[model samples]
Target: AAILEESMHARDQLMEQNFALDKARQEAEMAVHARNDFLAVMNHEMRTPMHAIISLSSLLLETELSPEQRVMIETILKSSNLVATLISDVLDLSRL
Candidate 1:
């Protein structure tokens, strides 16, 4: 009878540990989901303005400009494109 009681006590302790672990796992999973959601939202918000800058710059390039002005707009286009690419990479890293 004593052995049976001891076994039951051990089983209860294991169940308590399992419950705690499961709760921790669930909380960790929720945190990950929230992080991914934030990243997705940030990616969209950041990219929207970047797309506008890129498109508008391309449009400006189509118009006539002095050599210096042309260089400036081209530089804007190049830098904006690079920044947009970097933002996408950050979001991709979140997925990883």
Candidate 2:
């Protein structure tokens, strides 16, 4: 009778552990889904301004300008490139 009680206790402990593990697994899945959704929204927000900046810079480059004005255009181009790279990084993280 004592041996039977010990076996039953072990089985109950295993059941509890399984339940806890299942709960943790579900929580992890939900967290991942939430993060992915947030990243998608953030990427959308970032893309709009980035597109506008790039477009405006390209248009500015076509206009007549002094040397200093040309340099300013170059600066805008460089900054736009950096923003594009950051957007790419955010996209890569979402895939992971």
Candidate 3:
């Protein structure tokens, strides 16, 4: 009877440790998914502004610009495109 009680106590300890381990793993999994949620949310949030940036730049280009000014405006457009591309890649990463 004494040996059986000891065995039960050891089994209880193992179960407690395993339950803790399981909870820790679940928390880590949630942390991993949290970034993906941010990516998806930010991806949607960024698109509207990205479109506006491209559209606004296109409109600005219609007017005459000095050589210096034109280069700067072109750079702005290029940077906006790059931002969009990078965000899109993040969104893609979330999917994969």
Candidate 4:
């Protein structure tokens, strides 16, 4: 009878451990889904402003301006390039 009780106790411990593992897995999956949704929203938001920056820069470039104006355009182009690099990093992170 004691051996039977020990066996039953071991079975119960295993069952508890399995339940806990399953619960943890479900929670992890839910967290991943939430993270994906957040990334999607962030990508959309970032692209919207990025488009504006590119558009405005293009329009400014088209206008005839002094040497100072040319410098400003160069600055804008440099900043836009940096932003593009950051976007690429974000994309790579998502892929991982």
Q: Which candidate is the best by TM-score?
A: 1
The sequence of per-residue lDDT tens digits that candidate 1 reaches over residues 23-87 is 99999999988988888888888887889999999999999999999999999999999988988
Give the C-alpha miss distance for residue 64 in model 4, angstroms: 1.5
- Model 2 clash pairs are none
> Best lDDT goes to which candidate?
1
Per-candidate Cα lDDT values, in order, are 0.92, 0.88, 0.88, 0.84
Q: Candidate 2 vs. truth: CA RMSD?
A: 1.8
Candidate 4, superposed: residue stretches over 4 Å from native: 94-96
- What does the lDDT read for residue 85 in candidate 4? 71
* lDDT tens readout by residue for model 2, 1-96: 999999999999999999999999999999988988887887888888888898889898999999999999989988997878888796867653
Clashes of 2: 0
- The TM-score values for the models, in the order shown, are 0.91, 0.84, 0.71, 0.83
1 or 4, greater by TM-score: 1
Which residue segments of model 1 deviate by more than 4 Å?
none
Q: Give the Cα-based TM-score of candidate 2 against the true structure.
A: 0.84
In model 3, which regions exceed 4 Å deviation? 90-96
Error of 3 at 73 (Å): 1.0
